[PDB]
Design a binder for this molecule. Sequence first.
Ligand SMILES: *[C@@H]1O[C@H](CO)[C@@H](O[C@@H]2O[C@H](CO)[C@@H](O[C@@H]3O[C@H](CO)[C@@H](O)[C@H](O[C@H]4O[C@H](CO)[C@@H](O)[C@H](O)[C@@H]4O)[C@@H]3O)[C@H](O)[C@H]2NC(C)=O)[C@H](O)[C@H]1NC(C)=O
Ligand SMILES: *[C@@H]1O[C@H](CO)[C@@H](O[C@@H]2O[C@H](CO)[C@@H](O[C@@H]3O[C@H](CO)[C@@H](O)[C@H](O)[C@@H]3O)[C@H](O)[C@H]2NC(C)=O)[C@H](O)[C@H]1NC(C)=O
Ligand SMILES: *[C@@H]1O[C@H](CO[C@@H]2O[C@@H](C)[C@@H](O)[C@@H](O)[C@@H]2O)[C@@H](O[C@@H]2O[C@H](CO)[C@@H](O)[C@H](O)[C@H]2NC(C)=O)[C@H](O)[C@H]1NC(C)=O
Ligand SMILES: *[C@@H]1O[C@H](CO[C@@H]2O[C@@H](C)[C@@H](O)[C@@H](O)[C@@H]2O)[C@@H](O[C@@H]2O[C@H](CO)[C@@H](O)[C@H](O)[C@H]2NC(C)=O)[C@H](O)[C@H]1NC(C)=O
Ligand SMILES: *[C@@H]1O[C@H](CO)[C@@H](O[C@@H]2O[C@H](CO)[C@@H](O)[C@H](O)[C@H]2NC(C)=O)[C@H](O)[C@H]1NC(C)=O
Ligand SMILES: OC[C@H]1NC[C@H](O)[C@@H](O)[C@@H]1O
Ligand SMILES: [Cl-]
Ligand SMILES: [Cl-]
Ligand SMILES: [Cl-]
Ligand SMILES: [Cl-]
Ligand SMILES: [Cl-]
Ligand SMILES: [Cl-]
Length: 846
Amino acid sequence: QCDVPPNSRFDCAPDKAITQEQCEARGCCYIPAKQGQPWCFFPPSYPSYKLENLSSSEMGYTATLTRTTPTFFPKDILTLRLDVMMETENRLHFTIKDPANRRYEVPLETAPSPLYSVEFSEEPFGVIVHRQLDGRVLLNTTVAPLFFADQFLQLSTSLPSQYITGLAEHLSPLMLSTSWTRITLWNRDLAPTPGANLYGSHPFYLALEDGGSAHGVFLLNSNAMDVVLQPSPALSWRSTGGILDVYIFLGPEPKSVVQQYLDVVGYPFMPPYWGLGFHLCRWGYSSTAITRQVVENMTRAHFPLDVQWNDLDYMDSRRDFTFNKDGFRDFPAMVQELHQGGRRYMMIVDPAISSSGPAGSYRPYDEGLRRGVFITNETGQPLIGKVWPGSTAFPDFTNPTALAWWEDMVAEFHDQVPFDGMWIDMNEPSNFIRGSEDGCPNNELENPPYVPGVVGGTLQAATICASSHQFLSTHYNLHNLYGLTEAIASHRALVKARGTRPFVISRSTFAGHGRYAGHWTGDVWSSWEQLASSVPEILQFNLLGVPLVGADVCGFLGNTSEELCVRWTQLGAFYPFMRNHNSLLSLPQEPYSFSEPAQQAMRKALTLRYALLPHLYTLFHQAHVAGETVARPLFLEFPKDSSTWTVDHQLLWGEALLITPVLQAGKAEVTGYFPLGTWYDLQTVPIEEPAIHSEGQWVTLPAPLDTINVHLRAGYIIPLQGPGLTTTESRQQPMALAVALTKGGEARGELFWDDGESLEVLERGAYTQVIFLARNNTIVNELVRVTSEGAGLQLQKVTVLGVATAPQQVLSNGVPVSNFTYSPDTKVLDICVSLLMGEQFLVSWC
Ligand SMILES: *[C@@H]1O[C@H](CO)[C@@H](O[C@@H]2O[C@H](CO)[C@@H](O[C@@H]3O[C@H](CO)[C@@H](O)[C@H](O[C@H]4O[C@H](CO)[C@@H](O)[C@H](O)[C@@H]4O)[C@@H]3O)[C@H](O)[C@H]2NC(C)=O)[C@H](O)[C@H]1NC(C)=O
Ligand SMILES: *[C@@H]1O[C@H](CO)[C@@H](O[C@@H]2O[C@H](CO)[C@@H](O[C@@H]3O[C@H](CO)[C@@H](O)[C@H](O)[C@@H]3O)[C@H](O)[C@H]2NC(C)=O)[C@H](O)[C@H]1NC(C)=O
Ligand SMILES: *[C@@H]1O[C@H](CO[C@@H]2O[C@@H](C)[C@@H](O)[C@@H](O)[C@@H]2O)[C@@H](O[C@@H]2O[C@H](CO)[C@@H](O)[C@H](O)[C@H]2NC(C)=O)[C@H](O)[C@H]1NC(C)=O
Ligand SMILES: *[C@@H]1O[C@H](CO[C@@H]2O[C@@H](C)[C@@H](O)[C@@H](O)[C@@H]2O)[C@@H](O[C@@H]2O[C@H](CO)[C@@H](O)[C@H](O)[C@H]2NC(C)=O)[C@H](O)[C@H]1NC(C)=O
Ligand SMILES: *[C@@H]1O[C@H](CO)[C@@H](O[C@@H]2O[C@H](CO)[C@@H](O)[C@H](O)[C@H]2NC(C)=O)[C@H](O)[C@H]1NC(C)=O
Ligand SMILES: OC[C@H]1NC[C@H](O)[C@@H](O)[C@@H]1O
Ligand SMILES: [Cl-]
Ligand SMILES: [Cl-]
Ligand SMILES: [Cl-]
Ligand SMILES: [Cl-]
Ligand SMILES: [Cl-]
Ligand SMILES: [Cl-]
């Protein structure tokens, strides 16, 4: 009975230190580790739930689950209902609920055979999910007891391999460690460091299977939770409330698993085109004069900049929806001037609203009070905490009235200063004191029977009381949604205020966040370590459907070095959201603040990103319509190559662009994995060893300080556009194609183009979509949709990679071209043309 292999021992004392006598008294097994692995663990006979009265419907199955012997937690729910819904051929969904009481549930909008089968174990109860094609066991919850008590749910399963990713937000490799790892989801203001619960919580994992298939599991639960991985391999979800609401996505391809998950939580929002330009911010641009100098200094040194930002500096006494009348006296004019020059403007907004001002002197508070928009305490008054302005109340973004008040405050402020989006910070919600000015009461919500492994050892640490009252429920249940709900409210407020696509960047997030907003990784240090860690983290958020993500370029905390900021600017130009931001006391790190050689390297990075923007935009369109990733790990694209599975210091843009950054000081080369195929050096494409032929292998590449390695996959065509210091300017330039031929002379690509900012483009059909095809020494376009928005897009240059012999002639629509060049050393054919993306063309060579 207690002969259980070390790796398959499930912890029977997750709640407290326990003795042998206590362990045995719980009906558990005690065997000390020989050197984490639990000493007290469940025998196979440990009391669980029993399945009874299983029956079948057109939807799937239902059953009753009965527990006969209490667990060691209080308030077991002894009778539960199981509902199994076979929703699509790829998506299985099950719930375990209390049929006698509605429990808190996370608010969320809703040959022929499924890819899965489902079977059940009777006693102990478990759900077993097989992949039909190959019989692989994906889920098996029979491996450990089911616990379902009022403030403790535990459901375990075997995992199909040692390879699992997800469960943000944490500073870790992309592939998680199964060595007795405890992963805590409880949104928390803490600078990213390993082993800690950070700003967001996403209870989703993707698990790889031998051979390259995969599946995903989403537990729709917003309570504080630990997820415990052990090396058998196996996983335990351990939540402090709610219900078990479980989705399994069958893939089989990892990219399909992601798309299937996003079908449930929502596809990424389409950003405005300008949102993909460079953003520049710091805490400490303390006047409009200083802030204007940033744009002047960037422009004078030919650095592109689309969006100027301010941090707290603009506010009056650090309060939302104000600006001070000293340094920021002419804030409205500064923002109007930015617009006049073709740029946008972003500023920080915090959730907490100053509560200490004289009554009638501060409308956001006074109106909020009147309308009842704030989270309240035991006696029904606003919970008062401490943040930047001093004493503050906290908006309740589950209250419809608070949504309307937030819309009003944003619209009214926008009438004074026409900002183009919102940077929403401190929205965990972050509290400078514990719980509230008045502490928190003593009850089961503040002092629950199981506290997950949160920093500080309490749910109140750095945040508000858990038993505080919100419209939908207590904060205990809703905490992990605070940021998300604020992002939803801000998205709507911005739609209404501006009438064009919203641009929201948020610190705190929950599953489904990407449908409304983007994210940045928070207070990362200016260190080589954090530069390298940013790659897995950006990739992780793309797997979670938040493709508009990045880290603060050159780092936020501490002082960057020139070498670090070159390498960080190089890699960060491939963050889908690219912003350089800096803390109050740090040395300056704007691109123009460095030496000439460093400036040149930074300028090159920005120039290439701007050249790539039509392609990046199209990748975002694919994310938005099809649930694709924008930045993706090599394993998502080449999952049948098992050597890609642990690679997270390289990244792909889409299917075709491989970026291999230097991430260490003092390096002049880099070793990266190249999947099977031909990879062309993108430096061989004129922007205003030529080819790696890989069998699937590691390659060491020259990488001097001035360089980042970027390779284009054979078989693909990338649209490019001419230069500008803003997207307003760049969007008017002539376009180009980079055509990467296979050995057989084949390539394919696409362009999506719309006006860059309007709402409801796809629904109204107000966009142009063109496909490009290379075949048999010709290049053509295919006009999928041509509208007024794609009119007059001028194609003036076509660059072909992998042309093995010099051509004797090159034709564009049947006429010999004005001029072309061919380099026998690089196999590159560069062709000058006068064509239009929206009109059928044929280019050929022989
Ligand atoms: C729910 O939130 C509300 C706020 O929305 C919160 O109200 C706060 O209550 C405390 C008392 O519990 C108030 O503090 C008092 O303020 C007055 C004057 O400003 C003082 O005279 C009081 O002093 C007493 O307590 C001292 C202890 O150090 C004694 O030394 C002294 O002799 C007095 O007996 C006391 O500081 C506080 O001002 C309000 N906040 C606001 C904004 O009005 C309420 O407590 C919350 N409810 C729960 C259950 O937490
Ligand atoms: C899902 O997980 C459950 C629990 O781990 C698995 O069921 C267990 O399977 C083991 C090994 O096959 C069983 O132990 C064996 O029992 C037989 C018969 O007594 C004996 O001949 C062996 O010596 C061994 O002890 C165990 O009884 C069984 N547990 C339960 C509760 O049924 C199960 O196989 C997994 N399911 C799938 C499809 O992988
Ligand atoms: C499992 O179900 C039986 C029978 O349930 C009946 O048939 C179902 C299809 C549905 O129509 C139910 O409403 C019916 O009651 C349960 O056993 C019955 O229990 C009731 C009340 O305790 C009793 O009056 C009946 O005589 C019982 N009938 C039989 C055939 O035993 C049983 O309790 C269910 N088990 C669990 C764990 O819930
Ligand atoms: C980040 O650097 C600041 C400033 O550093 C100074 O100026 C630089 C140009 C360079 O010459 C440095 O060597 C200088 O020290 C540091 O802030 C200074 O801290 C020291 C001692 O802690 C203090 O005496 C100075 O007055 C500070 N100067 C300023 C301008 O604030 C800061 O400590 C560095 N930050 C970290 C985290 O190391
Ligand atoms: C923009 O650039 C100007 C010029 O490079 C900076 O102004 C200089 O600031 C230094 C302080 O380090 C002074 O010693 C110089 O006298 C200034 N020169 C000139 C010509 O004004 C300015 O600091 C930069 N502003 C920002 C926001 O980066
Ligand atoms: O607003 C001040 C400070 N708060 C915390 C944010 O993470 C950081 O970016 C910002 O500069
Ligand atoms: Cl002991
Ligand atoms: Cl509730
Ligand atoms: Cl553990
Ligand atoms: Cl399959
Ligand atoms: Cl390898
Ligand atoms: Cl032409």
